[PDB]
């Protein structure tokens, strides 16, 4: 029997299994990775602590890791992103998983801590992260365990106080040197998303990064696929399920025109909205204008737009003064990694009327209302099902290759305590594994053609500086 | 005083050229703002710039920006069909030496290139501004042979190659001993516009044969992600319509390559109503095309199917004689990469050509099926229409102007070695900012805490050097 898990309802396991099987067909990169590396067992002996949205897509990633020999414990990286049938299927598979759609913030962080209590005794020796939270727990406890505890008493956020309480409690409950023990045993971390990678470079630059990191976000086959087309498909998906609103003929405002903001603006435009964009980057703003988006300030958009999407990875994008100016029943959501892009806490003395899970109506003093999705959390994961499997297969094949490099291909210490990206050969290899399913017929260079443009026939085909 | 130091189709076109230059000025705020900012400061006073770059109206605005900054100038076009004759006439009528005719011969093309280096008043140039690297390459071949390596000069390859070798020997015969070493020593740098030219530069740098510092303007974000992409999106179909007047809605089009030019070319045709198929050798680029809903096929798959074919690779031997034998009657074939060997045009000389109009030819095969060829396989957007529109050229040419300033005025301490550089992101962002007012953008300003929160200064730069946009 198996009891080392927390999920919503284990009876959803058969439903999750059915959808996982369907996803496998949609994820040739992961399936082909199992076929190539399965016999090789490169992950035998790995103890991977995973912190990433516990979805059906993630379930295929987890079982790819296992098929390569990895021992695993897993949590979601957001309180609303778990798909409970995915989590149930992983638990029924005998993998410790702690993930519930709609868990509390305190549950979220205690579940993260369970990553590090390994079954059979000990600690993990790998981390797979999305947003850096698990990585941040190891570094925060380590910093405190070494005596610099001052920051632990100086919070300024609901989440951050809960997080600091976790770190104190772990220091009080766990053996000496538990964080030093963890930090010693972690061979590396692979990080999924822009915000988490930002956290890594803050540690790298300060000289506090405790183990090698691979930046999976900046694989071309991640950042130019997941962030772009993934959001192009899943943003309006989340809006439709939450609101069932007609998109044709409405005006939408997207804050940000990086990879996520580009995909977000395209999602709304393709659905029929007239899309305006904000930006602070003059290059990205010129991109938005040349694509036919009107580029305006949030002050300018607030009285006018029917729908608002923050996509910046920054904070305080949609403020309480913006929401006071919005038309009655304007829709507001967030597709960046963290909820502080919208001033959700400034709304809490207002009347909230819940409509359905992850959909609330908020009334202002002058009677106008707004429709908030997922309380400002990631709308594509909170209100729909995240990115579809196929594009997630590209991201998670990168993730698996990153795990293999850090765990198995660091005998010569080629990875120091810095942040790395996968080589272009592996980036191109990820793309190759997805060509058959979509029906691409790749042209083969002749040798004189390859010489002509200065590449080998087998690649890589571009300079490391190429932007695609 | 009278001015005679030029070669143009017809100098009576100058008033016409001047009118369209004036209109282009309004569409190129980046160059006009650069004039306002740098004119008074005269950063290129003393510069003698040899320019090899499509002699279009857009280029004329660049020329007069360089002049307004203090530069002394001589200019030629970098393709036999890309010149706009009214633009060349306006530059000549302004007293600027220029040698460019739309439809010039290959022999004329290289003879005019050599004329850039005989400077009015005596002497040589001290700067080069290049598009494709022909002018740079004439210097390095001449220098290389002036040193002693005479071998390569007696090996053809194509028709152009033979002519090009013939020029350097004539220049070795007629000019004083040491002429090329003396050019090479006075050239303070070169700025290069295009992907093929930059590939030529890096190949020289890796071989240790690059003679002077070089700035890769192509790989500024405000160039490659705008000019190459949106420019071709607007001027490819423009070239096809003017050449053929064909209905694009309903047709199947094939684009070879899905780099920046291929991306913009496929978009040009899709937006015009075509169903677009694409070829690629790069699996990442091919995956991008398929995620945009383009069918990714081989040129052999497309030959009997597509109504229109566009090569956009910067490679060679993309559309072969075997492909063209397979094409349906009166398929349209053209090329938007920098050089004309993407299509095996030489192989087509064997068949019966009927000229339709300038830069449009019908070619008949033994079984009587025919194809329509645009610009004899040269750059279709510049041969058959007017190249990229002014506004997107303003970004590219502001980059060129800043690159000329860097190499001519900001290299007193040799901070630029004999290597290939790109412009800093601060200048890349600068270029974009100069175009925001014209296109109506209202930029948001970060507050101090928001700038700290994402790790940037309020005034930028906003992205890591690794950022792909
Ligand atoms: N929901 C998802 O499934 C998903 C997927 C990938 C990434 N993300 C997250 O989305 C966020 C954005 O990621 P990204 O890859 O697009 O990063 P990015 O750096 O590529 O783009 C962010 C853009 O926001 C702009 N910006 C910053 N502050 C702004 C402001 N005050 N006003 C207007 N624009 C501003 C920046 O100039 C930048 O161009 C991150 O938090 C990332 O982790 C979410
Ligand atoms: N006409 C214009 O106005 C204009 C403007 C800019 C650049 N150019 C020229 O266009 C050419 C392409 O430039 P780019 O910036 O797109 O370079 P790029 O490297 O970004 O794109 C070229 C693509 O061609 C692909 N390719 C190479 N050989 C191939 C083959 N045999 N079959 C299919 N695909 C193949 C490469 O994989 C690559 O993705 C260059 O010569 C450049 O100088 C023309
Ligand atoms: N479906 C998904 N699964 C996991 N992480 C995701 N991030 C975005 N979409 C996702
Ligand atoms: N109109 C134009 N002028 C100069 N160079 C160009 N390259 C592409 N289009 C051009
Ligand atoms: Br109010
Ligand atoms: Br035939
Ligand atoms: Na999904
Ligand atoms: Na033009």
Author numbering:
A (entry chain B): 6 to 473
B (entry chain A): 5 to 473
From the reporting publication:
In this way, SAHase is a key regulator of SAM-dependent methylation reactions and of Hcy levels, which, when elevated, are a risk factor for neurodegenerative diseases, neural tube defects and cardiovascular diseases. A typical SAHase protomer is usually divided into three closely connected domains: an N-terminal substrate-binding domain, a cofactor-binding domain and a small C-terminal dimerization domain.
The incubation of ligand-free BeSAHase (§2.2.2) with Ade resulted in crystals with a dimer in the asymmetric unit, from which the complete tetramer is created by crystallographic symmetry. The first four residues of chain A and the first five residues of chain B are not visible in electron density. Also, one NAD+ cofactor molecule is found in each protomer. Moreover, 570 water molecules, plus two bromide anions and five ethylene glycol molecules from the crystallization buffer, were modelled in the electron density of the solvent region. Ade molecules were found in two structures. In both structures, despite the absence of the sugar moiety, the architecture of the active site is preserved, as observed previously by Brzezinski et al..
